[PDB]
Design a protein around this ligand. Structure first.
Ligand SMILES: NC1=N[C@@]2(c3cc(NC(=O)c4ccc(F)cn4)ccc3F)COC[C@H]2CS1
Length: 389
């Protein structure tokens, strides 16, 4: 049974541009679309005109706006945002039937933050206060929600990739998935949920203990997989891997798929590759298994993704009926990032109450009739020291 009908199908978007949920801020309520971001911890919204924003938070029109008289500056690798801190009443229309007073960073300047055509106007950082900006005294949204209401301290995400390109109209009209606030909806997954511990409450940090490509062990010291951390991050597109793991994985994926040769720019995630309509050779590309530490001592389980997850559908650079994709695995210098293309394979339970992350096969993962994504266990013979310090 699906017990959270009110919140099922409340997301829209896609791996290229992000998955978002509708929220309201202020009194009377101002509706905004907000990126669901498990890899940061600020609730930050556009609050001044911008060429890529169709709307924005207007603090002067909110009777419940409270000015904290404090700026926040947030540079990150790909860009930056800065703005002004305050609080206001916030609700999620397709969410729990509650309204909370939460911190809001009113974005006044940004660089490469907003995405033309994404249809979102702010971000909902769902990770922990430790990585909030300017510091850990700025209570994140979810903490406020839990403190102020009877909502259980847990949320779950089903991100649904289409498996093909969606034009602007289609992505607006399409259901992109679900964020279930306070619970687990059984209709969103098949098979069993398997849980891995949250190593530390800052990012949603986990520990990978083994990596296989088509069943072949990458055979790296498991610390390499978590150097310098491994996180589950809905606010990143790709599966990102530490440099040395990336190099070893790409070598192995190339070897598995070697019946076709792809240019270097494809493997660099820059260049698309295309096949005649319907003829994408899924079967030449390997499955990828990530083994995660179990809750039981000396046990692990694995999550297995298909090329239908790690090849991201993109429309052709020229007009055609070809099926085209970009390689959605890329190198990282800040650890492993299980981004949206990985999350598209799975229903993911962020069980904050029990300090654990659950994975099950998603009811909306893209596959073919020969192979599916999998979550399987337990495995009891693995060497598990895998965390980086
Ligand atoms: N997890 C991260 N969150 C941050 C962030 C994320 C994004 N996300 C996206 O555009 C995006 C697009 C496609 C996707 F499938 C997912 N996300 C945009 C701005 C931005 F600042 C906020 O804190 C650090 C920064 C960099 S890593």
């Amino acid at each position: 049974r699906g017990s959270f009908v009110e919140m099922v199908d409340n997301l829209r978007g896609k791996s290229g541009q992000g998955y978002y949920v509708e929220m309201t801020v202020g009194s009377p309520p101002q509706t905004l679309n907000i990126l669901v971001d498990t890899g940061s911890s600020n609730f930050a919204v556009g609050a001044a005109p911008h060429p890529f924003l169709h709307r924005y938070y207007q603090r002067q029109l909110s009777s419940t706006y409270r000015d904290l008289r404090k700026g926040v500056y947030v540079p990150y690798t790909q860009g930056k945002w800065e703005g002004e801190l305050g609080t206001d009443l916030v609700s999620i229309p397709h969410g729990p039937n509650v309204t909370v007073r939460a911190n809001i960073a009113a974005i006044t300047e940004s660089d490469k933050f907003f995405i033309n055509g994404s249809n979102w106007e702010g971000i909902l950082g769902l990770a922990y206060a430790e990585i909030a900006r300017p510091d850990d005294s700025l209570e994140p949204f979810f903490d406020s929600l839990v403190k102020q209401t009877h909502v259980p301290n847990l949320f779950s995400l089903q991100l649904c990739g289409a498996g093909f390109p969606l034009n602007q109209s289609e992505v607006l009209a399409s259901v992109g998935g679900s964020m279930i606030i306070g619970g687990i909806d059984h209709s969103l997954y098949t098979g069993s949920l398997w849980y891995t511990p949250i190593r530390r409450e800052w990012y949603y940090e986990v520990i990978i203990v083994r990596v296989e490509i088509n069943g072949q062990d990458l055979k790296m010291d498991c610390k390499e997989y978590n150097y310098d951390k491994s996180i589950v991050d809905s606010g990143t597109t790709n599966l990102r891997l530490p440099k040395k793991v990336f190099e070893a994985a790409v070598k192995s994926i190339k070897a598995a798929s070697s019946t076709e040769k792809f240019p270097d720019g494809f493997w660099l995630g820059e260049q698309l590759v295309c096949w005649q309509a319907g003829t994408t050779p899924w079967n030449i590309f390997p499955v990828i298994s990530l083994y995660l530490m179990g809750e039981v001592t000396n046990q692990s389980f694995r999550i297995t993704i298909l090329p239908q997850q790690y090849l991201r559908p993109v429309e052709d650079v020229a007009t055609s009926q070809d099926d085209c994709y970009k390689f959605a695995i890329s190198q990282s210098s800040t650890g492993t990032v299980m981004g949206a293309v990985i999350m598209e394979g799975f229903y993911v339970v962020f069980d904050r109450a029990r300090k654990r992350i659950g994975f099950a096969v998603s009811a909306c993962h893209v596959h073919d009739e020969f192979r599916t994504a999998a979550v399987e266990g337990p495995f009891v013979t693995l060497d598990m020291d895998c965390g980086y310090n």
